[PDB]
C-alpha cells in the first residue's frame, strides 16, 4: 500500500530492491495518528509535517500524509479492499467470546509483540479505541515493552532453560517408531 501511495505522490517503485528501500523508509519515517481527520486537516496546512529522506542515489523524497496513512490500514482494512475488521475490533471480539469473569483480567493485561507494532503512538490509539468500545466503568492498560522485537526468542530461550521442559522434547527413536503425526498431538 505504501508503494501504491508513493506512486500517487509521484515516486515509482516496482522491483524488489525498491521494495527493500520502501521497507526501510517505512521503518524510519512512519507513525500512527491519534485522529485521522484532524491529521488530514493539519496536512492541508502542509508546512510542519513533511519530511525528507535520502535515497542511495542521492535523490531526496518528501513524504507527507503517507507517514500516517499506511499504518491506518491496520485499523481500516477497507483501504486495501479486505472485507474484515481492524486489530481493535478483532481483539474486542476475541475477548468478548471468552467467559465473563476472565474478561476483567484480559482487559487488565494486554501484551503485544512483533515488528509491526513499533510505530510510536500505536499503544495510545489502541487504548483509546478499546476504552471507547469497552464500557467506561473500568481501567484498560496497555503494556508496550521496548524490546518486543525479540520477545519470542527470549521466551523460547527461557522455556528451553526450564528444567521441566528437558523431557518434553521429541527424540529420533520415538519419532521413527510413531511417525510424523506425533507432533500433532504434542501440545496441539
Amino acid at each position: 500500500y505504501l508503494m501504491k501511495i508513493l506512486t500517487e505522490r509521484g515516486y515509482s517503485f516496482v522491483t524488489t530492491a525498491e521494495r527493500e528501500i520502501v521497507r526501510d523508509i517505512k521503518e524510519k519515517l512512519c507513525y500512527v495518528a491519534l485522529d485521522f481527520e484532524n491529521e488530514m486537516a493539519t496536512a492541508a496546512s502542509s508546512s510542519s509535517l513533511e519530511k525528507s529522506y535520502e535515497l542511495p542515489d542521492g535523490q531526496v523524497i518528501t513524504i507527507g500524509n503517507e507517514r500516517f496513512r499506511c499504518p491506518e490500514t491496520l485499523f481500516q482494512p477497507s483501504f486495501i479492499g479486505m472485507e474484515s475488521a481492524g486489530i481493535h475490533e478483532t481483539t474486542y471480539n476475541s475477548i468478548m467470546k471468552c467467559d465473563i469473569d476472565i474478561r476483567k483480567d484480559l482487559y487488565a493485561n494486554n501484551v503485544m509483540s512483533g515488528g509491526t507494532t513499533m510505530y510510536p503512538g500505536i499503544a495510545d490509539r489502541m487504548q483509546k479505541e478499546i476504552t471507547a468500545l469497552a464500557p467506561s466503568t473500568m481501567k484498560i492498560k496497555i503494556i508496550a515493552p521496548p524490546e518486543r522485537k525479540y520477545s519470542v526468542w527470549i521466551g523460547g530461550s527461557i522455556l528451553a532453560s526450564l528444567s521441566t521442559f528437558q523431557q518434553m522434547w521429541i527424540t529420533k527413536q520415538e519419532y521413527d517408531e510413531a511417525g510424523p503425526s506425533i507432533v500433532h498431538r504434542k501440545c496441539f
Binding site: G10, Y11, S12, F13, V14, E18, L55, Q59, I61
Partner: peptide, 7 residues
Amino acid sequence: WXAXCPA
C-alpha cells in the same frame, strides 16, 4: 518520473 524511470 523523479525517482525510478526517467519522466
